[PDB]
């Protein structure tokens, strides 16, 4: 209907979600467990349906909305700011991912914390965090952006430190609190500089008149610093702290004692993506900045390598996922440094969806293992959590970027557009290559050690989960709702990623305008690649193949199948050679 296209209902449904969350928080005695669950489920489902309707219009067609709620605050003599929301491609790209992951995490969170005394508090905290993140990405001016920035930091401080009776979790939450205070300082100083320069806080206007101030300088006490350089420096600093780049990443692994739905939301999109959003929100500023040009690829590649290698050595499942998230944040920073804004969105969506699904599977495994998150005390879990095993296999083969999967394409697109003109290019490229191959190691380690190793766990788990009296059609080591949530999340992820791939990677370009005038020749090597580039990518392909052979055929222990393992490796090599000969030359 044309009325829906002219007047969005996203605002109405989001307000319904927010007000239901707040009133459930205040009137929690009237609503029991079931009442809170049902009310917030209805609100979140309506919000998701409305945003799903508008997703196609905003992404494919050139639809966007500027909504003003009213004049809000006086910030200068004779100056007032209003509460503005900008529902455009950049905002909807983050908001739809956050809302979908949040809907499925919400349904999963009731099965998780099944008999805990404070399920309602966790549900409402997750709702508050999602609302804050959605408000952050839908900002219309800088004041609303700062409000969302401070809200995501505050609500994540409560999802962390959920076990408020322990000071040990209080320390972990306070670490992130301090890092968020530093982020807020940097962002607010950058906003102050912007307002002192242009005397406006509207983002859109800022994106269209900042090029007029490229040749300007500011006078620090003994320095004359370019305006774009200092503004970009502060924005990049706060983005680095939120996105947990190297050095400022130490708060993120210590954030893992939060409940696993909170980890699924925080580490997949939302918080870790917030910094990336900033880079996408203010693209011209960083296009005109020398500091960004030098610092994004170097720090991104170092972070990618560091996170990828540290992840492959972890034994805690949540720590492995957290370090994988750090590596992927570095990869996203490099992808933004590429200069192609579509590749960033594709990487964001793929990583967020599959990382959230992997967190859900890991959370079910951890609940089965009775709060022991180290897979040194696991093994042979396939017969007790079969759905977890199979769904986890799918999610890890997609997340690790294995060949012939959806996650392969984002890595390939990243390596297509990499700029070779950097002074520190050798280090950047080596770090990127070493971080790209690390996914197979931690994916294989996690899957094999949790599900298909020897029994390393305690006898109580296995023996109590296998008594004869428990044989029934109702037998299960998880909940049906968890299985349905994971299944539907995977299906929706596949559908959305395929739709985005069609929109961006087809011969007919269909994506809406990204409001950026910096265009490079990166798509050429995607559209008309040449021979040396194909050979160069084949090199990394064969490196990954060698690593897969290593993780499959290496015997680190004595076994009755050692000799037969060597024989099978020899048979596979000979068969591959003969198969290649037959497929290439004769018939």
């Amino acid at each position: 209907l044309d009325f829906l296209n002219e007047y969005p209902i996203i605002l109405l449904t989001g307000l319904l979600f927010l007000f239901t969350t707040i009133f459930s928080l205040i009137c929690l005695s009237y609503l029991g467990l079931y009442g809170v669950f049902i009310l917030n489920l209805a609100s979140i489902l309506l919000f998701w349906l409305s945003m799903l309707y508008y997703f196609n219009l905003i992404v494919s067609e050139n639809y966007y909305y500027y909504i003003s709620l009213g004049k809000w605050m006086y910030l200068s003599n004779g100056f007032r700011v209003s509460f503005d929301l900008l529902i455009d491609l950049t905002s909807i790209s983050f908001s739809f991912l956050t809302l979908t992951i949040g809907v499925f995490v919400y349904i999963y969170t009731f099965s998780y914390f099944r008999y805990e005394p404070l399920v309602e508090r966790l549900i409402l905290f997750l709702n508050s965090f999602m609302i804050s993140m959605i408000l952050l990405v839908s900002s219309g001016n800088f004041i609303v952006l700062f409000l969302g920035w401070e809200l995501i930091g505050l609500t994540s401080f409560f999802l962390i430190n959920f076990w408020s009776t322990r000071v040990g979790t209080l320390k972990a939450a306070f670490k992130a609190f301090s890092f968020n205070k530093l982020s807020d300082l940097f962002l607010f100083f950058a906003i102050l500089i912007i307002f002192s320069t242009t005397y406006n806080l509207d983002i859109l206007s800022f994106n269209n008149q900042i090029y007029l101030y490229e040749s300007y300088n500011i006078d620090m006490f003994y320095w004359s610093i370019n305006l774009i350089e200092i503004i970009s420096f502060f924005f990049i600093s706060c983005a680095f702290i939120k996105s947990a780049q190297f050095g400022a990443h130490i708060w993120l692994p210590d954030s893992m004692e939060a409940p696993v739905p909170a980890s699924a939301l925080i580490h997949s999109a939302t918080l870790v993506s917030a910094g990336i959003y900033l880079l996408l929100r203010l693209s011209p500023l960083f296009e005109l900045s020398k500091y960004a040009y030098f610092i994004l690829p170097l720090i991104g590649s170092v972070t990618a390598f560091y996170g990828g290698l540290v992840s492959a050595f972890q034994s805690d499942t949540k720590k492995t996922l957290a370090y994988s998230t750090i590596s992927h944040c570095g990869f996203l920073m490099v992808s933004y440094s590429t200069g192609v804004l579509e590749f960033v969105i594709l990487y964001l969506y793929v990583h967020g969806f599959f990382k959230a699904a992997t967190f859900l599977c890991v959370g079910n495994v951890n609940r089965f293992n009775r709060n022991i998150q180290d897979f040194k005390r696991m093994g042979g879990f396939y017969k007790y959590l079969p759905f977890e095993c199979l769904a986890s296999f799918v999610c890890m083969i997609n997340l690790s970027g294995l060949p012939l999967t959806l996650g392969f394409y984002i890595k390939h697109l990243l390596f297509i557009g990499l700029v070779e003109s950097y002074t520190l290019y050798p280090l950047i490229f080596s770090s990127l290559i070493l971080g790209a191959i690390a996914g197979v190691f931690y994916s294989y380690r996690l899957f094999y050690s949790i599900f298909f190793d020897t029994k390393k766990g305690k006898k109580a788990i296995y023996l109590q989960a296998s008594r004869i009296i428990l044989n029934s059609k109702f037998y299960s080591n998880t909940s049906l709702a968890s299985n349905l949530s994971i299944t539907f999340l995977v299906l929706i992820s596949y559908t959305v990623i395929l739709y985005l791939y069609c929109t961006t990677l087809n011969n007919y370009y269909s994506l809406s305008d990204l409001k950026s005038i910096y265009i490079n020749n990166a798509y050429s090597y995607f559209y008309k690649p040449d021979y040396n580039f194909l050979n160069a990518v084949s090199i990394l392909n064969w490196f990954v193949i060698i690593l897969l052979i290593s993780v499959i055929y290496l015997n680190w222990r004595w076994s009755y199948y050692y000799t037969k393992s060597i024989d099978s490796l020899s048979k596979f090599i000979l068969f591959s050679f003969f198969f290649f000969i037959f497929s290439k030359y004769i018939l």
Partner: protein
Amino acid sequence: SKAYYFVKNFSWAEVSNLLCYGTKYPTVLNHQQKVTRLYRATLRRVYAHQVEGYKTDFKQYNENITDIGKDFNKMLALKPESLELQAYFKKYEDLQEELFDPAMIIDESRPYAASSGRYYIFDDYLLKFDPFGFYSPKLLSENRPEEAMPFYEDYPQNDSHWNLWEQFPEDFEDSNAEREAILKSN
């Protein structure tokens, strides 16, 4: 056993002592106590690395525990002042250090575990507390006066003191009925 290895500002020597022996001060233990505690710590570490490990080999684990048992049986029968016993102590403390993991698995039953103290348990003092009488009956007398004590009202939960003078219904008849009756009588 309290697993406060890293949440207190300990040096490595204190942590090594706590890992090898159940105390920071192993000098106050007997010879048998020290030998048994070191044997238990060594077996615990070997189990944590060769049974609940990464690529565990049961045959190698059995060989190593057999050798360790032989060595500790030799250790027990030695004398405390002998240098060979000191060498054995040094060797197995070095073994404990060499297998040290910053990511030790801590059993959930230990006092300073990852999931310890997640819930506040209310004792009978809080369960039986009811100042106002909705859940448990409350006397209008507010207490039972024990002998050898005067009868005094309980201290209220809210000592506001923001009170008016006593309120009476409108047109309240408050004449001195007794005085009037007696004066009429005489």
